[PDB]
Symmetry: C3
């Protein structure tokens, strides 16, 4: 859609608006099964070599079944992403539970099984090795050799991925679940029509946010749980907040005070509140849609958005940190770049065909990506995002000029506007 961005000179921050939400709120757990076979000349020797790989893969999966679960980011909660999948896997260890799946997939490769614990799970049979080995390889004991290696390949690959990932893999590979299997799983998933179209148009993002959990191998059946994301929040407004240090620009070194907004990250409207994602690298952006997981979020009142327009508003205590580290840095935003230039650092913005077109002076400034290709801060070169969108420069006096350095708390790790004001009042009273 229409992505916009506003830079606030007063607080050295920028907000990118125009995004749509796709927040993970639930999990769909499906049981993927592979039917195995009960096993007690140069060409035939190749079959036994390939058959030993099958026997080793089963043994490795048995050993694998034993060892298996069966800025403000430090404020996040502690949870287990695969807990719902582990619950389905625990049920499969009950007596007769695997037989239910085995009987449901006797005539077809796709059925809905109601487990004993009550969970109704869609179950696939993606590879039938019992059918192949018992009917094609059992009576014998070059086309058979080649056909066997291709058919047996998927079991070997699934075993390798599970082995080097403690039985839990993410993203879900095409060997764990092919595109046709995943798309058909999405189509028959008991979800909204908006969710079906969303997941179908973003199959890769679904893979990256899914888990494959090695579960059980019993009664000639290998079963693993594929945990797919359910996006219960769709098409609500999201915005990304970029922050950078804001310092005074006094010439004499060591007399400068700094202030940095610590509330950077992704913000999305969610159920009357705002889901705040402090580590923006945990979200995946597709054009104008941002895919996040609510497990990596903090639930904040919607008034937190007021800190972008008025950092001194009384309705929300805007979070900042203070220091005297006036080092130069840059933040590449969605439609531009924030440049915090201090000291003797060379800060420029250049175009690919013409060289330097803007020289940044001391302080915090901003340039849009229109006509700009790269930004240099010191000895480092940064490439700006070339995505289309309008940027708006909101002129304002840097709020750091409002503070007296003699009483400014110049080392607050995780403070706020009111917290700094309270400390100033205590220091001024002593004077």
């Amino acid at each position: 859609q229409n992505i916009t961005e506003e830079f606030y000179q007063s607080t050295c921050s920028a907000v990118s608006k125009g995004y749509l939400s796709a927040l993970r709120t639930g999990w769909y757990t499906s049981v993927i099964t592979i039917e195995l076979s009960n096993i007690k000349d140069a060409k035939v020797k190749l079959i036994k070599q390939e058959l030993d790989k099958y026997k080793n893969a089963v043994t490795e999966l048995q050993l694998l079944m034993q060892s298996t679960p069966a800025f403000l980011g430090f404020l996040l909660s502690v949870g287990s992403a695969i807990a719902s999948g582990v619950a389905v896997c625990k049920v499969l260890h009950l007596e007769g539970e695997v037989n239910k799946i085995k009987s449901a997939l006797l005539s077809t490769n796709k059925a809905v099984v109601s487990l004993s614990n009550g969970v109704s799970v869609l179950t696939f049979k993606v590879l039938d090795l019992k059918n192949y080995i018992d009917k094609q390889l059992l009576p014998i004991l070059i086309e058979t050799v080649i056909e066997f290696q291709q058919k047996n390949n998927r079991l070997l690959e699934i075993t390798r991925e599970f082995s080097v990932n403690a039985g839990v893999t993410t993203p879900v590979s095409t060997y764990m679940l092919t595109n046709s299997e995943l798309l058909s799983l999405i189509n028959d998933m008991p979800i909204t029509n908006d969710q079906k179209k969303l997941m179908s148009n973003n199959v890769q993002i679904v893979r990256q946010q899914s888990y494959s959990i090695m579960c059980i191998i019993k009664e000639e059946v290998l079963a693993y749980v594929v945990q797919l994301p359910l996006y219960g929040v769709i098409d609500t407004p999201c915005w990304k907040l970029h922050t950078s240090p804001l310092c005074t620009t006094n010439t004499k070194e060591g007399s400068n005070i700094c202030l940095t907004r610590t509330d950077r990250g992704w913000y999305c409207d969610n159920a009357g509140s705002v889901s705040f994602f402090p580590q923006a690298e945990t979200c995946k952006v597709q054009s104008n849609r941002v895919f996040c997981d609510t497990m990596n979020s903090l639930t904040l009142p919607s008034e937190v958005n007021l800190c972008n327009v008025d950092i001194f508003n009384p309705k929300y205590d805007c979070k900042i940190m203070t220091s005297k580290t006036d080092v130069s840095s840059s933040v590449i935003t969605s439609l531009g770049a924030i440049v915090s230039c201090y000291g003797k650092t060379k800060c420029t913005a250049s175009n690919k065909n013409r060289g330097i077109i803007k020289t940044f002076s001391n302080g915090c400034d901003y340039v849009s990506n229109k006509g700009v290709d790269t930004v240099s801060v010191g000895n480092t070169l940064y490439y700006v995002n070339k995505q289309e969108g309008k940027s708006l420069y909101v002129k304002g006096e840097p709020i750091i000029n409002f503070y007296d350095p003699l009483v400014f708390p110049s080392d607050e790790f995780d403070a706020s506007i009111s917290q700094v004001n309270e400390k100033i009042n205590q220091s001024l009273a002593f004077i």
Copy 2:
């Protein structure tokens, strides 16, 4: 075994007891060798397949060139230093020849290196034998397939080493098969109790092992597999869960917070306590916790007193202060800690019965008995359904003992005594 858990309302923390230790204290380094060879429509497939072998050897030669809350207090070390030491020995003249001669008659031998380390040495793939007897005279489609199967493991080993800078972890089944690993464990010069432990957790051994690409010389490809030795076994371990503890005043901006920063895994070890500040560095198998002592801090055993009496004089319990009253939850072994502040909706529900506990402002705790999920704001967390008894130790939140006008807020890494010291300095000025 018997997993128990105690929640301390006074300090907003919980301890899960009943675990047994398995701490990595040493390394066993083994030298894994693959013997290499110095080098029609159907033969065109062989020459294409032979180039894959030739490129993998060339790639390994280029690879040989490139030689191999309180977590910020951890020490700086190299996990593969012991394996690299063995790899440095293999570059000496005649050192590879000893391994080459020791594996002439068998695929498994114990070689004493020049530096003194006695290492078990495997020959897992013999390509010189295959190439010299079947492919040398030729330069039958069955031979082509036989070559691809024999050469497959070398391509995979080269592939894994290439995208991992020559050091891979966990050790894949291509670096070391289960039979090779089990036989390596069986002939390892360790106790029979340690052999059974490593054999019953071979995958965990893989996850805590390293494969170090080493040398390719004199028709021999050698890489070092570094297996963990668990020198601390079956000592008591406990996990400490912490969550922010804040006052619950209605008027915004007048609240102070306090959080115990000493969360993580704790295990008894040689008269002291090994403290693992980042609990994600340990692997739990039922009631046994596998950690690496390299990710631990050695603390006096009196650190345990912080759970029963945070104001005890024997240990200065570590805390951090702030005014960030955001709501959060911690899923423990047998329950969940919920820090609910402001206007946040914090509840605990059953899937068939709905909400059974509504958390009020402050720090509280719910056991997993009858509870399936915990909701804090817009986030849903699932509790552990494992069986075990929880004990709720009623207590006045210690944050109520402090005067907010002199309370040192925004202390990044402080302690009980350190906060008291700043309060006395602030009170004296008044």
Copy 3:
């Protein structure tokens, strides 16, 4: 070369000198293309099974094309693949793939001038349209082919496409390091050789191809007009052979008997330092650099540009030209730092801190405070219940004797728990506390 190291007892820090720089400063973007074909008995089942893998890989690549893209907290925020994504955005323009398609008609290697002006080297590393249209089209248009060699030849020919699709699928279309399937050694060396760079840069990249792979990105881009194109982003080393040094720091605390009365001080400016264009490139997280013997490969994106006077903090932490960065606390836990030619040991409380030889046992027992031991005769360092191995690399260590600067401060007014402070900031806070008295 000659690696040396100096330990400063006064500040509980060590500097390792003698390294040479190889800093990533720019990106070279090349377009790697694979020409694909438009496609409408026991063996025919094998060919169609292998043909379905080709068709499934193309579909997966299409879905993949749809979804297209101590002081480290002070580092700048950027996108490492922005330059490659910018080139990939150009390839979505009409007729842009056709230009590449026509430019690689006669050769497998050509320089294409894009519409926006960027000149990119373009490779054709695999021609599947040539194989399928000439060998597989007549067979399927009739069936029942009788020599099995064609089936094996097809799967081997199709193998590289399957692997590239697999790596791109489980990595969101961006892979790093660049595998040999994305770009073979022969392809990479020829790409390096024809890269319009200095001969010094060519020799450096050729002798360290693995580091080039590890510092490169492969970005899946577009699949259109029977052409699969992905962008490989290779590192440009614009800073070469300048002096580098690594600064190791450890907490420096007092050793008072009464518990809880001790103050601590730690230099926070640890990391890699390299001379660069009159300033110093400072890499606070040293784990982001790769060391090859005595050459250090870093990426400037993980660096801060500091004035060269920052080096004065190693010889005189109280110098007036640069405000040396420190942090203060009262956390007297024991820890160790393994340096290039030794080990720093901060031993506090009742912890057992020793340095031992495997054949000779303990040769140094550390007392309370911060000390240092060289790797001469030392194999391991033990702090508490943890064992660390020292580097056995040859080199001279110099012990710069000095009284620990923490003894210069009065604990009653010492500003404890300063998360990110400095020498001057601590002095300023002390002066305000002393004025109140």
